[PDB]
């Protein structure tokens, strides 16, 4: 649903 930058690292 979401691009990689939508997830914190």
């Amino acid at each position, epitope marked *: *649903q*979401a*691009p*990689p*930058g*939508a997830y*914190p690292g």
Partner: antibody
Amino acid sequence: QIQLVQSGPELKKPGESVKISCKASGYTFTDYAIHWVKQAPGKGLKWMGWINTYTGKPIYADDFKGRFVFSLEASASTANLQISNLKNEDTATYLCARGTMMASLDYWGQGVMVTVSS
Amino acid sequence: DVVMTQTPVSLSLAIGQPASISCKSSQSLVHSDGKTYLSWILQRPGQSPKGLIYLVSKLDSGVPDRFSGSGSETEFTLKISRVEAEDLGVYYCWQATHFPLTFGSGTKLEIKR
């Protein structure tokens, strides 16, 4: 047609709580992320985070951890924003937007203008 | 946070003239998956934004082909081949390669008549 229609109160006192609704129609609600975006009257756009519409899992930008709760009413195709303990700085338009994996924010709600005033 | 800087802050162009807006990122928007998550939106007077472009150069459904995007790592451009009266408003680039998602400072397009 694809639309996001928002609603909520436009005036609250400092300390109070507000609920802002984002109703999706014309598409599969659970196939697309909802992103929450703060727009200061005058200024640009600040990402608050997003909610997975399939799992219900919210992810918060650091500046929006604590007083900000993203939730679903999945059977009403609605995403909800709760802001609690309202402060002077929360006066803004709150926007919801439909998001894809390829990072389109294609369709946006009309926003809700919340004024925090005594 | 990735800082997205846009120039010019504003421009005034006649109908039929070409438009070029620049967007600079404070770090490479090329992700380890090989994709570049730079996008553009437009917000016209008093209204909610609309998506225009994603993955640097891909037009959102229904967006006129007068619009195009180009760029590389930290430099991106939105181009209008031929400006029309309804293209007016504030163009924002925005990125989703790095957490959190961030929006540019915005460029306001005025129509000269």
